[PDB]
Amino acid sequence: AAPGKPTIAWGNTKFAIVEVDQAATAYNNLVKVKNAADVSVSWNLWNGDTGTTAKILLNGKEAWSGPSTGSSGTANFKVNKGGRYQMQVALCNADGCTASDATEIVVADTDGSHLAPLKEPLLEKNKPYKQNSGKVVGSYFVEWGVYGRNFTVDKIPAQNLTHLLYGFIPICGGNGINDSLKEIEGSFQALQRSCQGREDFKVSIHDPFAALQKAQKGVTAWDDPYKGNFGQLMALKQAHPDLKILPSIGGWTLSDPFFFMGDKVKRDRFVGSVKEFLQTWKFFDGVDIDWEFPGGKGANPNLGSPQDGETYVLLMKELRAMLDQLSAETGRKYELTSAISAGKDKIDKVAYNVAQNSMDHIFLMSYDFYGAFDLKNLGHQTALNAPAWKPDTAYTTVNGVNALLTQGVKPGKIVVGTAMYGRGWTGVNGYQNNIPFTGTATGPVKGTWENGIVDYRQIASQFMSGEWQYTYDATAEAPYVFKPSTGDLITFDDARSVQAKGKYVLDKQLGGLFSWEIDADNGDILNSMNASLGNSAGV
Numbered sequence: 001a002a003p004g005k006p007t008i009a010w011g012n013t014k015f016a017i018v019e020v021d022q023a024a025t026a027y028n029n030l031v032k033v034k035n036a037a038d039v040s041v042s043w044n045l046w047n048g049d050t051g052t053t054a055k056i057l058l059n060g061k062e063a064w065s066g067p068s069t070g071s072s073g074t075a076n077f078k079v080n081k082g083g084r085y086q087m088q089v090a091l092c093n094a095d096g097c098t099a100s101d102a103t104e105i106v107v108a109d110t111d112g113s114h115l116a117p118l119k120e121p122l123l124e125k126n127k128p129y130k131q132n133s134g135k136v137v138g139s140y141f142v143e144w145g146v147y148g149r150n151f152t153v154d155k156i157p158a159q160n161l162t163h164l165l166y167g168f169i170p171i172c173g174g175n176g177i178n179d180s181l182k183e184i185e186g187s188f189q190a191l192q193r194s195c196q197g198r199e200d201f202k203v204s205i206h207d208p209f210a211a212l213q214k215a216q217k218g219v220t221a222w223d224d225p226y227k228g229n230f231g232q233l234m235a236l237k238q239a240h241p242d243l244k245i246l247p248s249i250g251g252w253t254l255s256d257p258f259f260f261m262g263d264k265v266k267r268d269r270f271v272g273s274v275k276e277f278l279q280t281w282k283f284f285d286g287v288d289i290d291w292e293f294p295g296g297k298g299a300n301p302n303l304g305s306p307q308d309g310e311t312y313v314l315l316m317k318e319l320r321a322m323l324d325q326l327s328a329e330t331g332r333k334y335e336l337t338s339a340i341s342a343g344k345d346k347i348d349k350v351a352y353n354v355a356q357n358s359m360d361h362i363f364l365m366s367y368d369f370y371g372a373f374d375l376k377n378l379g380h381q382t383a384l385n386a387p388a389w390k391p392d393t394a395y396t397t398v399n400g401v402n403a404l405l406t407q408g409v410k411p412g413k414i415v416v417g418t419a420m421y422g423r424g425w426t427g428v429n430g431y432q433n434n435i436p437f438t439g440t441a442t443g444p445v446k447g448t449w450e451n452g453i454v455d456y457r458q459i460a461s462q463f464m465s466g467e468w469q470y471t472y473d474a475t476a477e478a479p480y481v482f483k484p485s486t487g488d489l490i491t492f493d494d495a496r497s498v499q500a501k502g503k504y505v506l507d508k509q510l511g512g513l514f515s516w517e518i519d520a521d522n523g524d525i526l527n528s529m530n531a532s533l534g535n536s537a538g539v
Ligand SMILES: CC(=S)N[C@H]1[C@H](O[C@H]2[C@H](O)[C@H]3N=C(C)S[C@H]3O[C@@H]2CO)O[C@H](CO)[C@@H](O[C@@H]2O[C@H](CO)[C@@H](O)[C@H](O)[C@H]2NC(C)=S)[C@@H]1O
Pocket: 140, 144, 167, 168, 181, 184, 187, 206, 250, 251, 252, 253, 254, 290, 339, 365, 368, 449, 450, 453, 516
């Protein structure tokens, strides 16, 4: 007779090729990369002969074999490819093999190969678009948005994007290296903790809880190897295999380390850490460099050197050569991008006509042109053109694109930025001819999360009734709302200024549009990005 039918023993069924240690706060102990998951299966035989060989089958294929020596057994073996597998124990002798009922097991890997697709319905005013324009449609999702803003990866309108950028991946470094973080409560200490035991100038994860452990839709089971933003991004990738998801390194508060990268020892260390990071977190499709800014005038008033332009071009070249080597190992296409100042004075510190040869896209940060950081000189924060009242306005979108084009940047590389938020002032007074921008302010507008800044969502739902005037400047291509009694003035992008940006992109054969930041939109901004670049409606 063939052997009796074994019963799989109750026990853990989820395993990981990259393991996350659940009691560790240092990135180096938090993440353990192995060549294969260590899987274990046990079984009992309640009736019949135990056979002479026991096998573990995964989808019918043997992963382990050994002598069957008793009524109970355990197999420990390695599985090097992620997936959900129908696992059976089979007992064999000379007269046949008898296989257990299948138990599904999970072998987790950071491509999300073990995850059900995260395919969620569009929310708020988001309408479905097909990505068939061949243009970039990008937005940033912020790591910390999962807390007070309560905006998680399942709320991203992912079908309506070609690029999703994750803000922000930090670079390790204490005093002198990440001093801009100190202006944010607990933020500098969170990075030191994450970077404990890790060399400076290597990438890390700023909030490992938000990135990997916070329970979220699709990753709420205690034994899910990956949770938080990264676990959901993995499942998002499974739903949207052609979405490019790029880790963004830098930003306003995490740019200080770039200023030291004229030292090739530090630069090589950084590039190698980026390579390792992408080998570790397979769901990412490249890297976005957000260095604010070569030459200084970023958050840190003590950094900035004339050497920064040269450092920037060397960094892009070296990152491209590392990515080409990774593409060759893996067979995937990897992208290299950078978010840059749209101000001509900052643009002219870098030879983008040289760096473009390494880069897929330049994300032109054509926003924050004006704001509550200057109470004397008011203007449109994200306009396409100058306004009629000051045609020589320095900071406009067209001036930033023209600076790049004049360098010799190819128009197809240039991705024009739109704002999903407004900037604003209170107490505006002293203006001429009913144009509030010609006056001066006494403070920042009351903000959604921080002073002087309002989510586009709140502008649309709260500041288009009562005493609020609404004006679309058609010369600038720029909307604004104004409440004269309090002098509250807010400058923002709307469906119409975005449509003008998209038309301009098509006119000038630019690369597409991108936006900061995805949690602040109600759908109006992203619908308009998609429509204006000519993407067709419908799922
Ligand atoms: C007004 C806003 S939304 N400021 C956030 C800021 O954003 C910049 C951004 O860095 C720069 N890079 C782009 C890419 S687009 C461009 O413009 C946006 C908006 O002008 O980014 C800061 C981080 O670099 C944000 O800081 C964080 O602030 C929140 C509190 O509001 C805090 O809880 C987080 O811990 C901070 N994140 C850090 C990494 S320090 C800022 O909100």
